[PDB]
């Protein structure tokens, strides 16, 4: 008999003041939270953010909504959420978020006989995640999502994860083109602003960028060109045209491939690691050309000294390049 | 009791005229303001703007909302704000502003027994900042946010910073990859339009641009290519093809340099510092090539004069380039 249920619902909402939290003037109301992650679409290095779609569900007991005589869960139309008190939960590190509204607003209100209220939403958010790209592309990131009450302090509302470490689900099925999720963590704490102490929940993922075709295509050409630039020392004074052609080719080819590589790197204006590596390779080819120039100049007056300098370079250049590669590997790998 | 508080609030809102400001027809209402800066998402030179997320808090007194019998501060629901008088504060230099609305409108209303209203909003605004790129990338940018009352003149409303120089916090939370904040300032004044005089508050920031990326990517390659261009002065006339190849290589590489961040700048009519440096380097390389052409043309009939020209150039060019660098870095820095 839907008439009896309608009478019960109208009686519950009669004299219901939405401007007062449950147990107003008394103990704080405990709100439990569950998150079901659906996808993580884009983790933008340029914009320093990531997109996240979730089913966000909250639970709280309200004594004003306790009904008797109906032994069933009452799943009400989502518009009833406009007549009930709901927590003012918000995210602190989001830049633009929306609740889906097709075909209707994705919102769920479920009342239980003991006054328990379950309030569910489907939310797509763009959360800010600062990144330390100084180790690009061998970088690791820690992206967090923060949850807090906007108006009620810990004297009025308390947050907690409903289910301990098994509250947030679906992270394992999340797949990304670049990164791979290694760990996720849940934290509950209190944050003290100048207005008071508010509850805080934090869901933090750790991402590790993959390694593949791009790692080879950004180092191997440059190191191969730098290695090939050392054949200049083993060429005698005869066939010096080959030496000049080799030096010019190394310079031109390295510059061309460096530009065609930087055309694909993320457009952020600060010093990464690959940029320093490419600068080091360019400095090496420049030094090789300068050494060739000096040897050629002093060749006529002191041929023995020029030959000795070439012999010295034969050992010096690979050793210094290996030493610099070792330093780079220690500092940035 | 909840019913008693509900009755008190209903009595407060009963017979309340939202259309009339507090003390209508009498003294102006004093509004204090606080800003807590969450972050600055981006600072764009193409569109000449910057994105700013903040908590904006306003403080005023409305004697019509004064209540007695409750020794508590009523932190009410956000929707209650729709039934009160709030100032018409707006930002004169904003282009797209919105209040975050997930999971609810990030709005806070707090009433006090003295009839004192505190009203908090979480606002993301894209403010318009006009930039002088004459010294790019060695420039400082002063970006302001203007806060003004739209409909109420100085006879109706007054603005001030609540707390003084400490009214704006969260300045240290701002992290920009290509900028570093130097200083922030608070200004209070009056602005006169054809419709009357209005109060005005101003929050100013002075950002400084990071130079490390530009030194790594622009200045060092150009200096290295300019140095490489001088190699031809130490080459004998018998190796004329080497000199031609060296000059052509230097010119081509100088043209190739600095194609990394073309799209992230507007179409300004003037000339920037980086453009000046690139033009100077290109002029030096072109002059070296022209000197080679002149020497090769004249060396057949006047070998001694060509030798003198080469021996003078190999000293003049490095000195001239050093003087040019001295003038550049003494003027712009």
């Amino acid at each position: 008999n839907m008439s009896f249920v309608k009478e019960t619902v109208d009686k519950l909402l009669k004299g219901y003041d939405i401007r007062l939290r449950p147990d107003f003037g008394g103990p704080p109301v405990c709100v439990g939270m569950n998150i079901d992650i659906a996808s993580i679409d884009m983790v933008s290095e340029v914009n320093m953010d990531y997109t996240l779609t979730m089913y966000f569900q909250q639970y709280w007991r309200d004594k004003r909504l306790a009904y008797s005589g109906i032994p069933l869960n009452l799943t009400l139309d989502n518009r009833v959420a406009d007549q009930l008190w709901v927590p003012d939960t918000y995210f602190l590190n989001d830049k633009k978020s929306f609740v889906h509204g097709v075909t209707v607003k994705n919102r769920m209100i479920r009342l239980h006989p003991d006054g328990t209220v379950l309030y569910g939403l489907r939310i797509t958010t763009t959360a800010a995640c600062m990144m330390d790209l100084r180790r690009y592309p061998l970088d690791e990131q820690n992206c967090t999502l923060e949850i807090e009450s906007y108006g009620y302090t810990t004297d009025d509302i308390e947050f907690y994860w409903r289910g301990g470490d098994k509250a947030v689900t679906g992270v394992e099925r999340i797949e990304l083109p670049q990164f791979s999720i290694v760990e996720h963590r849940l934290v509950s704490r209190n944050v003290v602003f100048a207005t008071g102490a508010y509850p805080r929940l934090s869901l933090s993922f750790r991402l590790k960028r993959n390694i593949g075709y791009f790692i080879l295509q950004t180092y191997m050409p440059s190191i191969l060109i730098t290695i090939l630039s050392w054949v200049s020392f083993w060429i005698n004074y005869d066939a010096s045209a080959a030496r000049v052609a080799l030096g010019i080719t190394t310079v031109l080819t390295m510059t061309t491939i460096n530009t065609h590589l930087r055309e694909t790197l993320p457009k952020i204006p600060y010093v990464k690691a690959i940029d320093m590596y490419l600068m080091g390779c360019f400095v090496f080819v420049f030094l090789a050309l300068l050494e060739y120039a000096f040897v050629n100049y002093i060749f006529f007056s002191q041929p023995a000294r020029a030959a000795a300098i070439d012999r010295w370079s034969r050992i010096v250049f690979p050793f210094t390049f290996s030493l610099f590669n070792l330093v780079y590997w220690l500092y940035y790998v | 009791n909840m019913s008693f508080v509900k009755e008190t609030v209903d009595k407060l809102l009963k017979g309340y005229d939202i259309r009339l400001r507090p003390d209508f027809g009498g003294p102006p209402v004093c509004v204090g303001m606080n800003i807590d800066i969450a972050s600055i998402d981006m600072v764009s030179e193409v569109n000449m703007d910057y994105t700013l997320t903040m908590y904006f808090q306003q403080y005023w007194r409305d004697k019509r909302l004064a209540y007695s019998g409750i020794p508590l501060n009523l932190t009410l629901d956000n929707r209650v704000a729709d039934q009160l008088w709030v100032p018409d504060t707006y930002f004169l230099n904003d282009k797209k502003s919105f209040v975050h609305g997930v999971t609810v409108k990030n709005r806070m209303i707090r009433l006090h027994p003295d009839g004192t209203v505190l009203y908090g909003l979480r606002i993301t605004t894209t403010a318009a900042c006009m930039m002088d790129l004459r010294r790019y990338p060695l420039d400082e940018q002063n970006c302001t946010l203007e806060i003004e009352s739209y409909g109420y003149t100085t006879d109706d409303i007054e603005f001030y910073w609540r707390g003084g120089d400490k009214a704006v916090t969260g300045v240290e939370r701002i992290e920009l990859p290509q900028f570093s904040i130097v200083e922030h300032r608070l200004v209070s004044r009056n602005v006169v339009f054809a419709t009357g005089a209005y109060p005005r508050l101003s929050l100013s920031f002075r950002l400084k641009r990071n130079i490390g990326y530009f030194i790594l990517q622009t200045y060092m390659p150009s200096i290295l290519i300019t140095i490489l261009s001088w190699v031809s002065f130490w080459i004998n006339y018998d190796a004329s093809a080497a000199r031609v190849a060296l000059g052509i290589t230097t010119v081509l590489t100088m043209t190739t340099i600095n194609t990394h961040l073309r799209e992230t700048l507007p179409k300004i009519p003037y000339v920037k510092a980086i453009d000046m440096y690139l033009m100077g380097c290109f002029v030096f390389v072109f002059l070296a090539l022209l000197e080679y052409a002149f020497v090769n043309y004249i060396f057949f009939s006047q070998p001694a004069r060509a030798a003198a020209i080469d021996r003078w150039s190999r000293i003049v060019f490095p000195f001239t380039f050093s003087l040019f660098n001295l003038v550049y870095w003494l003027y712009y820095v």
Partner: nanobody
Framework: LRLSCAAS????????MGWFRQAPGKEREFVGA????????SYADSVKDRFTISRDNAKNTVYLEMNNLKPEDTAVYYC??????????????????WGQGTQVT
């Protein structure tokens, strides 16, 4: 004098360093705070124009220079790290990791 706070580990997740002083009869109180890229050296009112805080990421150190010492300056000093979204700056509860105490006469 000149105190130095040096951080080791995941320093990027805690980009704000703060100084606190504790008296024998009073709880720890905020003195200064520095952001690596925020450029806003925040100071307490009692230590304005007398203490200075500088930063350097070359070895990830924060320098606290003290000038015009007073008898009330005798307190044990601590250095603490604060998260990116940890809230207020003047409140010791928001800081996760703390440094060993140091005495100044």
């Amino acid at each position: 004098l000149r105190l130095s706070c040096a951080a080791s580990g995941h320093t990027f997740n805690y980009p704000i360093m703060g100084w606190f002083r504790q008296a024998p009869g009073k709880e720890r109180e905020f003195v200064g705070a520095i952001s690596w890229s925020g450029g806003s050296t925040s100071y307490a009112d009692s230590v304005k124009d007398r203490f200075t805080i500088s930063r350097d990421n070359a070895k990830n150190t924060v320098y606290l220079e003290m000038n015009n010492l007073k008898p009330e300056d005798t307190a044990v000093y601590y250095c603490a790290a604060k998260g990116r979204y940890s809230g207020g700056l003047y409140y010791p509860t928001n800081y996760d990791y703390w440094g060993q105490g140091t005495q100044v006469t």
